[PDB]
Amino acid sequence: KVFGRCELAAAMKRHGLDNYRGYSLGNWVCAAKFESNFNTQATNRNTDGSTDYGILQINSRWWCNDGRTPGSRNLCNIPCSALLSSDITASVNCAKKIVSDGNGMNAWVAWRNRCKGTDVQAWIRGCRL
Ligand SMILES: [Br-]
Ligand SMILES: [Cl-]
Numbered sequence: 001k002v003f004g005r006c007e008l009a010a011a012m013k014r015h016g017l018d019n020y021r022g023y024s025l026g027n028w029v030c031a032a033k034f035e036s037n038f039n040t041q042a043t044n045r046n047t048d049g050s051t052d053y054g055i056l057q058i059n060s061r062w063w064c065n066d067g068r069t070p071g072s073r074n075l076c077n078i079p080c081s082a083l084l085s086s087d088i089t090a091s092v093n094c095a096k097k098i099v100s101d102g103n104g105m106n107a108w109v110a111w112r113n114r115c116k117g118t119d120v121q122a123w124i125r126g127c128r129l
């Protein structure tokens, strides 16, 4: 599913990301825009053989099982395919674990480079919320 900006803001709010670990809703919308272009089916293969999945491009080295990242972990206890669903619940619940691990939203390279320190509240303006 390819979300619109305001549609995703509303879904992220419904599914519990608003101010999770102190990160306002716009941080998450901005991160999703630049990680996945709001596409739940986004995937990116890294040159280490791991893959990033879903609207927040969650990586198979630590967070999900894809059967093709040898020796990796699955801390979210999910198949990586669950991160591609039109329902963002699994991505949200896994993102909650990631952002809680000590590094906050710096786990998301696009957030650090393109959202951190900007007026992230802009990403939710004009939306029915
Ligand atoms: Br949803
Ligand atoms: Cl694996």
Ligand SMILES: [Cl-]
Pocket (backbone or CB within 6 Å): 065, 066, 078, 079, 080
């Ligand atoms: Cl699995």
Ligand SMILES: [Cl-]
Pocket (backbone or CB within 6 Å): 021, 103, 104, 105
């Ligand atoms: Cl933090």
Ligand SMILES: [Cl-]
Pocket (backbone or CB within 6 Å): 024, 025, 026, 027, 120, 121, 122, 124
């Ligand atoms: Cl915000």
Ligand code: NA
Pocket (backbone or CB within 6 Å): 035, 044, 052, 057, 109, 110
């Ligand atoms: Na990325």
Ligand code: NA
Pocket (backbone or CB within 6 Å): 060, 061, 062, 063, 064, 065, 066, 069, 072, 073, 074
């Ligand atoms: Na894995």
Ligand SMILES: [Re]
Pocket (backbone or CB within 6 Å): 007
């Ligand atoms: Re939707």
Ligand SMILES: [Re]
Pocket (backbone or CB within 6 Å): 119, 121, 122
């Ligand atoms: Re703003």
